[PDB]
C-alpha cells in the first residue's frame, strides 16, 4: 500500500555476477542495518566463476558495495592413506544468504568434493558447502555436512543407501531464533532430499582450516526412505521455520518438496527430530507446489500461518484451455491441536508465464494497521513481462484477495525482478518496515522504502 515507488535506491554489482540472486538484511552489534547480497557467478582468483558475497551499507543513493571476503582456493589434504579434495569452480557461492544476530551465512550449493584412495575414489560430486562470517571480528567458519570418505565401491555393495554425495547443502537455508542453522539439500540420499541442522556456535567452535573432514556432534540430519513417493522429490528445495505445535519450547520446520510423489509436489511440517506433523499435497502435477514457503501470522491471532507458492500452476480458462500463471496458497493455523485443513485463500497470477508465487516475502505490518502483510513476486509478470511484485494486506479473515499496491520492474527485460525478496526490516529507521528486491539478471538490487500512509 505505502511503499514508495518514486524514489528508489539501487545497488549494483559486476556484470555477469548475478548480483542479487539472494539477499537479506543484516544488523551489526550496534543495530545498524545493512544488506547482504549474493552473486553466484562473481569471478574468483583463476578468472573463473566461483560466486561471491557483498555487504552493502545503507545509503539513500545506493551505489557499489564492498566484498565480504571468503577463501576461494581449492583445498587438498593427504591423511589416513586417502586424499581429500574440494573444488570451488562454479560452486555458486552466494546462491543463498541469510543473516542471524551479527553473523552471515552464505552457501555454495554446487561446490564439488572427491576422495581418492589408490585407484579408487568416492566420485567427484556436488555436496555443497556453507561459509560463515562475523564481519566485525573477522571470524570465519565453514559447514559441509554431506562430505564423506566412503569409496564408490562401498555404496554399490550397500545398494546406495544413505548416499549424501549430491546433497547440494545450502540450496536453501534458514536460522532459528535460538541460532540453529537449517540447510536444505534437495539432492540428499540419491535425490530424495535431506535437511541438515547444527547450532551456529558449534559450527564455529568445532571448525579449523585445513581439516576438511571434521565432526559437529550436536548436528542432526534427516533420514533416508524406501517409499517411492519420495524419490526425486527434492525435499528441501525450500525451507522455513515457525511455531505449529502449540509448544513454544520447540521449533518446527517447514520443508518444500516441489516434485514429491511423481511431481505432485508437497510441503511438510516437522518437529526438530524430523518427525512429520502435517503434509500439504500439491493440487496440480508439475506446478512446482513447494517451490517457496513463507511463515507468518497474517490474521493477527498470534498463530503462525503458512504460504505456499506454485509458480507453474496452470489455471483453467474458456474452451478447456490451460494457462500457466502460477498460484499461492494460504493456510491458517487453527486453534489448539488440530491439522491444517483446506487452504483459506487462493491467489492466482494473470500474466502468461509470469510465474506468480516464485517468491513470497513476509513484510511485517507495512501499513501499521495491526495485521502482518506479504509480498508476492512474479518475476516475468506485468503487461510487458518485465516482472512485478504484488503486495497483499493481512486482515481478520486472512488476506485481502486483491493487492493494495503493485511494483513494476525498473530494470530492462530479463532482469528476473522479484526472483528474490526480503522485507520486515526498517533500514532507514523511519518506523516503517521496508522491502528489498533482487534482480540478478540486471546484477542489481532495489530498495523500496515504506512511508506514512497517504
Amino acid at each position, epitope marked *: 500500500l505505502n511503499l514508495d515507488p518514486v524514489q528508489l535506491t539501487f545497488y549494483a554489482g559486476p556484470n555477469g555476477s548475478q548480483f542479487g540472486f539472494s539477499l537479506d538484511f543484516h544488523k551489526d552489534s550496534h543495530g545498524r542495518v545493512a544488506i547482504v547480497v549474493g552473486a553466484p557467478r562473481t569471478l574468483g582468483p583463476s578468472q573463473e566463476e566461483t560466486g561471491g558475497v557483498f555487504l552493502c551499507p545503507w545509503r539513500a543513493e545506493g551505489g557499489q558495495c564492498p566484498s565480504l571476503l571468503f577463501d576461494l582456493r581449492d583445498e587438498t589434504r593427504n591423511v589416513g*592413506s586417502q586424499t581429500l579434495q574440494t573444488f570451488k569452480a562454479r560452486q555458486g557461492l552466494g546462491a543463498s544468504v541469510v543473516s542471524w544476530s551479527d553473523v552471515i551465512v552464505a552457501c555454495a550449493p554446487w561446490q564439488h568434493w572427491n576422495v581418492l584412495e589408490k585407484t579408487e575414489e568416492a566420485e567427484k560430486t556436488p555436496v555443497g558447502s556453507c561459509f560463515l562470517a562475523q564481519p566485525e571480528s573477522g571470524r570465519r567458519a565453514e559447514y559441509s555436512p554431506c562430505r564423506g570418505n566412503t569409496l564408490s565401491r562401498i555404496y554399490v555393495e550397500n545398494d546406495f543407501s544413505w548416499d549424501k554425495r549430491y546433497c547440494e547443502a545450502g540450496f536453501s537455508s534458514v536460522v532459528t531464533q535460538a541460532g540453529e542453522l537449517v540447510l536444505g539439500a534437495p539432492g540428499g540420499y540419491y535425490f530424495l532430499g535431506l535437511l541438515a541442522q547444527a547450532p551456529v556456535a558449534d559450527i564455529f567452535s568445532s571448525y579449523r582450516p585445513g581439516i576438511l573432514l571434521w*565432526h559437529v556432534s550436536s548436528q542432526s540430519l534427516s533420514f533416508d526412505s524406501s517409499n517411492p513417493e519420495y524419490f526425486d522429490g527434492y525435499w528441501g528445495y525450500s525451507v522455513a521455520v515457525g511455531e505449529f505445535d502449540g509448544d513454544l519450547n520447540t521449533t518446527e520446520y517447514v520443508v518444500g518438496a516441489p516434485t514429491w510423489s511423481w511431481t505432485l509436489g508437497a510441503v511438510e511440517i516437522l518437529d526438530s527430530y524430523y518427525q512429520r506433523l502435517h503434509r500439504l499435497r500439491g493440487e496440480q502435477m508439475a506446478s512446482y507446489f513447494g517451490h517457496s514457503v513463507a511463515v507468518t501470522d497474517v490474521n493477527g491471532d498470534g498463530r503462525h500461518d503458512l504460504l505456499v507458492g506454485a509458480p507453474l500452476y496452470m489455471e483453467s480458462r474458456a474452451d478447456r484451455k490451460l494457462a500457466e500463471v502460477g498460484r499461492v496458497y494460504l493456510f491458517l493455523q487453527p486453534r489448539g491441536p488440530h491439522a491444517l485443513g483446506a487452504p483459506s485463500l487462493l491467489l492466482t497470477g494473470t500474466q502468461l508465464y509470469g510465474r506468480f508465487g516464485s517468491a513470497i516475502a513476509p513484510l511485517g505490518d507495512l501499513d501499521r494497521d495491526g495485521y502482518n502483510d506479504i509480498a508476492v513476486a512474479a518475476p516475468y509478470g506485468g503487461p510487458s513481462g518485465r516482472g512485478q511484485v504484488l503486495v497483499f494486506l493481512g486482515q481478520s479473515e486472512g488476506l485481502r484477495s486483491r493487492p493494495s499496491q503493485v511494483l513494476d520492474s525498473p530494470f530492462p527485460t530479463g532482469s528476473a525482478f522479484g526472483f528474490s525478496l526480503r522485507g520486515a526490516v526498517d533500514i532507514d529507521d523511519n518506523g516503517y518496515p521496508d522491502l528489498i528486491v533482487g534482480a540478478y539478471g540486471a546484477n542489481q538490487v532495489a530498495v523500496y522504502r515504506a512511508q506514512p500512509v497517504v
Partner: antibody
Amino acid sequence: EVQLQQSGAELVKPGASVKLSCTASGFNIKDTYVHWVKQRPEQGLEWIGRIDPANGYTKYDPKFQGKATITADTSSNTAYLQLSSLTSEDTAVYYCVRPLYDYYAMDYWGQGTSVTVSS
Amino acid sequence: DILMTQSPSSMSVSLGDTVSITCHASQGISSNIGWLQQKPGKSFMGLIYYGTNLVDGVPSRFSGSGSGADYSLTISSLDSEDFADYYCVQYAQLPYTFGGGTKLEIKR
C-alpha cells in the same frame, strides 16, 4: 560430556580368548571412528585397528591380523575387542580411542583395560 | 609403516622452565600429527591435533609447531601437573604409529 568406560581387568590362561568392551557415555558410539591401542612398558604404544560402528567396516594393522577382531553394537552403545590364542606377549593394557573434531585424530581415551595371560 | 623418532627420551627440568619435545617422521606427514599426555598411573589425554590445534580444555601454555617431517611440542612455564609422559602419533598413513615417548622428570 564425552567419556569412554572400558571393562574391568581380565585374567585368562594361555591359548584361551577374551573379549574387551568400550561403552560410549554422553554420546552415540556411531558418531565417529573407534580405535584400539595396545600399550607395553618396553615396547610402547601400538595401533591395532579401527571400526566405524555406523556400518561395521574395519581396518587392522597387519601385525594383529588373525589375533585381533573389532566389533560394535550400536544398540548397547559399545565397541568390542576380541583376542584369541592368547600368549605372554599379549599381556598388555588396551585402550579405546576416538577423535574430537578431526575425522582421523586420536583425542579421547578410555581409562584402559588390563589383560594378563598366565597358567 | 612410518617411523616416529621422538626425542629426547627424558629430560630433567624445573617449574617455570620452557621445554620443547621433538618428533621426526621417516617421511612427510603434512601436520597430520597429534600429541598425547599420560600422567603417572593414569590414562591418556589429548593435547594437540593436526599439528597446532589445541584439544578443548587444554591450557594455552601448550603449543605445537613444525612441518614436513619435523614437529615440536612446547610447554611455556612448566606447571607441577605437567611432569608426565608425552607421546606423538601420526595419522597421515595407516597403520597409525606412535613415537617412543618422552618423560619429564623433576630436577634436583
